[PDB]
Amino acid sequence: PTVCRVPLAHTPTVTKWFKGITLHLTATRPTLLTTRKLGLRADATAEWITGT
Amino acid sequence: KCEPSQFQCTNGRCITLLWKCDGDEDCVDGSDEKNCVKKTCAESDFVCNNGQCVPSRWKCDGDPDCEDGSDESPEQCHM
Amino acid sequence: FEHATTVPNVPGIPYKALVERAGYAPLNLEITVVSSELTPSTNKEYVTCKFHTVIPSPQVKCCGSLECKASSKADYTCRVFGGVYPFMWGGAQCFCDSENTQLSEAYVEFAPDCTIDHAVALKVHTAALKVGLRIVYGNTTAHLDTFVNGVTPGSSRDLKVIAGPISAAFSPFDHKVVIRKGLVYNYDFPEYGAMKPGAFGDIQASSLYATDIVARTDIRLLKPSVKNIHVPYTQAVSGYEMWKNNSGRPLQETAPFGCKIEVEPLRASNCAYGHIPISIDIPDAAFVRSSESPTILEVSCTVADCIYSADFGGSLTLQYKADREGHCPVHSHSTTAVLKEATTHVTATGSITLHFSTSSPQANFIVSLCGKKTTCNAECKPPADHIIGEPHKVDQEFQAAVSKTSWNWLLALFGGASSLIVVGLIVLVCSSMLINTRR
Ligand SMILES: [Ca+2]
Ligand SMILES: [Ca+2]
């Protein structure tokens, strides 16, 4: 076991509206984006996002 | 204390493990250098008779550098 | 002495309560859930990883026969072939033209790199809850951990805290769980001793260094065809590799209630759900006689403006008069409005500004300054920021969640709809008795 170095993606810009947010993501190479609610049920999502 | 992937110097600081045994002094007291077993010397670093690694240009410059002063020895450099 | 309370199980938001006794000045009470753990009892079933087939050197007999033997190695397979006439670099290795018997073996073993890349199958029982509070009373602060069962007296020094049973029993783990390199998956692994080839758990053992590995990978041995020595064989795909390819997503990203799954030991940290019925035994040393505490002759509250935002989006001020000086506690006797400050200095006459928060469009709660309950009323507007980065500090009510004007409209409408019917009823009955008395 040891430590590697991994890239940090471009920080997204959030647009806020009523009961919902919008993410503006840029990524030159495939990147992972996961979400999950903090309620009783968790609508977990997973997506490999590339491009703007 | 800090997470085991980070080494803690004997001063109160924690740094990443890649800085340990790397040839560079990062802890304020140099605890990350004189603890490992590395002994390699580069081409430009002449190895003194005592085993210490010293730059080659240091040799026979008119002043003692090594602990035993092998650099100023007339055997090494002839005047 | 003893106080019974119900603090919501949210990790980080404070809870304010006011406890008092006759002849004793009221004392502020602050409860916080600093951190929570959900450690279930686990039992290790077996350890699995990517198997590495081992094909020992073939054994052949020039003119004779061999009998397959039985061995304890995992998925051992043996076969005997009738005529081979094998070759190596140097020519034929036997003199019988057709009486050459070849014996083939093939078993499985743990790959050398399995000490790092290996999964563990676990069975989890009922989960237990343990929390660490930051109870604050008077001018003192205490930290302690306790088990949420209703009987354990988890106490730092003399707090004597008894956290009652959790309102709702919840556990993010199903019965069978799988751990691999710190990632926890909810999987239904096959039971020990029943391995299906080509799936997870095709090879299992009680430990990585156990000598009783058992496996079933559907090894098939084939009849040799080429002249030079060979041990042809075919095998199922590594079930561990298949499961790795089709893992899905871990509990670190599927678990609900904002739980943070972590291992060593397997546990869920900082989950938010339900309520905890705590009970505190405050020592009498903290309480101070009412005569010593300064008294308020009068107090009137006026509120600047309010938005029912999650943060402390509200303000309040009050005038006061007292015959002394000191520290007094301020509390809001409502379930929809929480103050920010617990205590505040008082100096005869003056005015103090206190910040609060609410989730109702009415600041129509009661505020007490070491007694002397006072009534505030305001005109709470909705907030402007659609999204905030801080959890709501007060659970949304219903009876207070409706504006005074809307309450008035509905009340007036229902009142009219209930009044016209009764007035019609009464005029009907009076006329009916009039008609009955007519004759
Ligand atoms: Ca160093
Ligand atoms: Ca010199």
Q: Please report the DSSP string for B35-59 in residue order.
A: TS------TTEEEPTTS-EEEGGGT
Q: Decide: C86 and C226 in contact? Cβ < 8 Å.
A: no
Distances in whole angstroms, Cα of residue C373 to Cα of each of B14, C237, C411: 53, 75, 28
Q: Decide: C152 and C165 in contact? Cβ < 8 Å.
A: no
Q: Which two tokens stand for residue C318?
A: 């009050």
Which residues lie below 8 Å from residue C193, measured CB to CB, with a gap of 6+?
Answer: C214
Which of these, C155, C242, C231, lies nearest to C203 by C-alpha position? Answer: C242
Interface membership of C338 toward A (CB under 8 Å): no
Give partners of B (≥3 CB pairs < 8 A): A
Place of tokens 């997506």: A47
Rounded Cα distance between C278 and C7, Å, is: 7
Rounded Cα distance between C326 and C320, Å, is: 13
Following CA atoms B51, B56, B62, B68 in sequence, which dihedral angle do they give, to the nearest 10 degrees? Answer: 0
Instruction: Please indicate whether, in this complex, the C-beta atoms of C256 and A37 are within 8 angstroms of each other.
Output: yes
DSSP 8-state code for residue C266? T
Rg (CA), chain A: 14
Instruction: Please indicate whether, in this complex, the C-beta atoms of B16 and A3 are within 8 angstroms of each other.
Output: yes
Rounded Cα distance between B61 and C183, Å, is: 60
Rounded Cα distance between C8 and C14, Å, is: 9
Ligand 1 center to A4 CA (angstroms)? 17
Gaps after which residues in chain B, C–N over 2.5 Å? Answer: none
Compare CB distances from A40 to C253, C256, C386 and report the shortest one's residue. C256
Instruction: Name the percent of chain A in helix, strand, coil, to the closest 5.
Output: 0, 40, 60
- Report the gap between the CA of B42 and the closest CA in chain A (Å): 26
Rounded Cα distance between C429 and C393, Å, is: 55
Place of tokens 């506690």: C329
Q: How far apart are the first and last CA of chain B?
A: 56
Q: Which two tokens stand for residue A3?
A: 């430590």
- For residue B55, whether the previous peptide bond is cis, meaning omega lies within 30 degrees of 0, is no
Q: Decide: C274 and C39 in contact? Cβ < 8 Å.
A: no
Q: How far apart are the first and last CA of chain A?
A: 35
- Kindly report the number of other CB atoms within 10 A of residue A35's CB atom: 13
Interface membership of B18 toward A (CB under 8 Å): yes
Q: Which two tokens stand for residue C397?
A: 């009510």
Interface membership of C256 toward A (CB under 8 Å): yes
Q: Decide: C167 and C15 in contact? Cβ < 8 Å.
A: no
Rounded Cα distance between C70 and B41, Å, is: 58
What are the b/e assignments for C219-234, b being 16+ CB within 10 Å?
bebeebeeeeebbeee
Coil, helix or strand at residue C138: coil
Is C76 exposed, middle or buried, given 0-12, 13-18 or 19+ CB atoms closer than 10 A? middle
Q: Decide: C280 and C6 in contact? Cβ < 8 Å.
A: no
Helices (H) and strands (E) in chain B, counts: 0, 4
Q: Decide: C138 and C286 in contact? Cβ < 8 Å.
A: yes
Run of H or E residues at C410 = helix C404-438
Query: Which is it for strands C279-281 and A13-17: parallel, antiparallel or unpaired?
Result: unpaired
Rounded Cα distance between A38 and A47, Å, is: 19
Rounded Cα distance between C318 and C300, Å, is: 5
DSSP 8-state code for residue C46? E
Rounded Cα distance between A41 and B11, Å, is: 48
Give the total residue count for chain C. Answer: 439
Instruction: Outline where DSSP puts E strands in C22-115.
Output: 24-31, 33-48, 51-54, 59-61, 77-81, 87-88, 91-92, 101-110
Rounded Cα distance between C329 and C190, Å, is: 60
Rounded Cα distance between C294 and C348, Å, is: 9
Q: Decide: C5 and C19 in contact? Cβ < 8 Å.
A: no
Q: Which of residues 380-419 of C touch A (CB under 8 A)?
A: 385-387
Instruction: Please indicate whether, in this complex, the C-beta atoms of B16 and A2 are within 8 angstroms of each other.
Output: no
The whole-angstrom distance between residue C193's C-alpha and the CA centroid of its chain comes to 33
